[PDB]
Structure formats: structure tokens, C-alpha cells
């Protein structure tokens with residue numbers, strides 16, 4: 298840091314670390330000290346290739362949507378330095394995860410959620426049109442355009458509030474075209490779809506599951522899947538949404554998870570009781586039974602349909618009642 302790359306970008310600060318490497322903030326000395334973000338990919342095969350893929354994906358999408366009408370991050374250039382791939386991006390604000398966290402996990406206000414959601418659904422339906430599936434949607438990969446605030450007070454402390462809740466989607470290193478190889482395991486665990494967990498094959502619907510999981514988190518301020526074990530994650534889905542359908546059970550080869558034709562889960566085990574305590578039927582999560590909240594929850598529920606063929610598409614989701622107050 299103070300390190301110069303490409304003889305124009307001076308690292309000032311670190312914005313993010315990760316599997317792939319890091320994202321830093323740089324001053325661009327040839328663009329009148331204006332500021333950008335640079336992703337510095339680890340010098341490691343699987344990350345260079347995800348980065349190579351990210352770049353091809355993002356050139357296609359810059360070609361198709363040069364003005365980020367569909368809210369993907371804009372890549373400005375790429376180069377190499379000490380055999381790290383380096384991707385220059387427009388400078389964004391905080392992730393939606395970082396923002397919530399830095400508010401003490403105070404959920405987002407429903408008006409901001411409606412909007413943020415609409416943008417995320419717009420962005421990813423645009424990928425789904427170009428035969429891409431993101432595979433790793435989560436609040437860490439949805440970032441505010443800038444995250445500026447008002448230090449307003451409240452009697453249930455000094456929270457920050459969103460003037461402008463515009464988002465972009467980031468992280469296209471895992472985005473998979475329909476005609477390409479599909480990795481066996483995608484998504485971060487808490488945002489991962491049952492078809493992925495059961496190894497049924499996946500495609501575009503898996504992103505919709507993830508989106509459902511994100512909206513729940515924006516609303517609750519915490520995850521409804523607080524787990525790192527696959528079977529328990531399934532037991533949690535059941536407690537929140539009812540039994541898995543027979544034909545998904547019949548079709549999976551993850552036999553380990555099942556006894557006779559039912560999840561091999563003892564509800565009265567220690568793990569059983571942890572699930573019963575942290576998880577309950579979806580709608581019992583609602584903090585008010587007014588009309589708007591019933592609509593969010595009708596959507597979420599549709600995004601959390603077990604059967605990927607039956608699950609709502611983002612085409613359909615973009616015409617959900619929940620989205621009216623926007624026009």
C-alpha cells in the first residue's frame with residue numbers, strides 16, 4: 298500500500314479479502330487522482346481461471362449493457378502484475394452485508410428492501426437471459442453504489458440510513474453458461490438450494506433460491522439457516538417449509554441423508570432441538586401481518602419452492618404485487 302501498479306494506480310486501502318485474493322482502493326494518478334477498485338487475484342490456477350472467466354463474462358455484459366441498466370458492476374480494464382490478474386472496477390460503496398452488520402444487524406426498512414430486491418431480480422434476470430447463472434448470490438456480493446447516510450436517532454441509539462439504495466451485483470468468477478461445465482457444488486452454504494445439496498443438477502433456478510435467502514436476511518437481519526452441516530440444513534428447510542417432495546427424495550443419490558423415504562433426522566436430538574429453536578414455519582417469522590409484508594412473504598415462499606422446475610422465475614418475480622409501490 299503506497300505500492301503502484303500499472304504505473305498509475307496507487308493502493309490506498311483494502312476493501313475486501315477473499316478466496317480469490319483481495320480488492321483494494323486505488324488512486325489513479327493518470328485520471329486526476331480519481332478513485333477506483335482493483336481486484337488482485339491470487340497467483341493460483343483455479344483463481345486465475347475464474348478471473349479469466351470473470352473478464353470474458355464482464356466484456357460480454359459490458360458489450361450488451363454498456364450502461365449497467367441491468368446493474369452488473371462495470372469493469373474498466375484488466376492487466377497483470379507479478380503474475381496476478383488485476384481487474385479494475387468502478388468504485389462501489391459497502392456490500393449490503395457490511396452495511397447491515399455496521400448497523401448492529403438492524404434489518405432494512407421494507408421500502409428499501411422492495412427496491413433493492415427489484416434491482417437484484419433485474420440484474421440476475423438479465424444474466425438468466427444471456428444463458429448465465431451467477432451461482433454465488435449473497436449479501437456480500439450485492440454492493441451499494443455509494444453507502445452515504447444520515448446519522449438519525451431512535452428509541453429502540455444512532456443508526457445510519459440509506460439516502461440512495463442503488464445496488465450492483467459483483468463477483469462473476471463463478472457464473473456458468475448453460476452450455477458449459479456445471480460444478481457439483483455451488484453457492485455459499487446458507488444461500489444454497491436444495492437441488493445443489495441433493496446433487497440433482499442445477500441451473501438458473503438455484504439463483505432464485507439464493508435470492509429468496511437474501512431477502513429473508515434483509516428483512517430479519519440474520520440468516521434463517523444458521524448451520525454448516527448439510528443434513529441439518531435440510532432439517533432446517535423442513536421445519537421452515539414442510540417436507541421435501543417425494544420425487545426429489547427418490548431421485549437423489551445422497552442416501553446417507555435418508556431413512557426409508559424420509560429425512561434421517563431425530564427432532565429430539567441435541568441438533569434437533571437447536572433447529573426447532575432457531576427455525577420455524579416461514580410465515581411465523583413475519584413481524585406484522587399487514588398486506589405489504591404478506592406480499593414479501595408470498596414472494597419469498599415462491600423463491601423457496603423446493604422443486605426447481607416449479608420455482609418462480611425472475612421474469613415472473615419481477616411482476617409480483619410486492620413490486621407495485623415502485624411505479
Ligand SMILES: Cn1cc(-c2cncnc2N)c2ccc(Cl)c(Cl)c21
Pocket residue numbers: 312313315320334336370386387388389390437438440467468469
Ligand atoms: C469490496 N468489493 C468486494 C468485491 C468482490 C469481488 N469479487 C467477489 N466478491 C466480492 N465481494 C468487489 C468487487 C467489485 C468492487 Cl467495485 C468492489 Cl468495491 C468489491
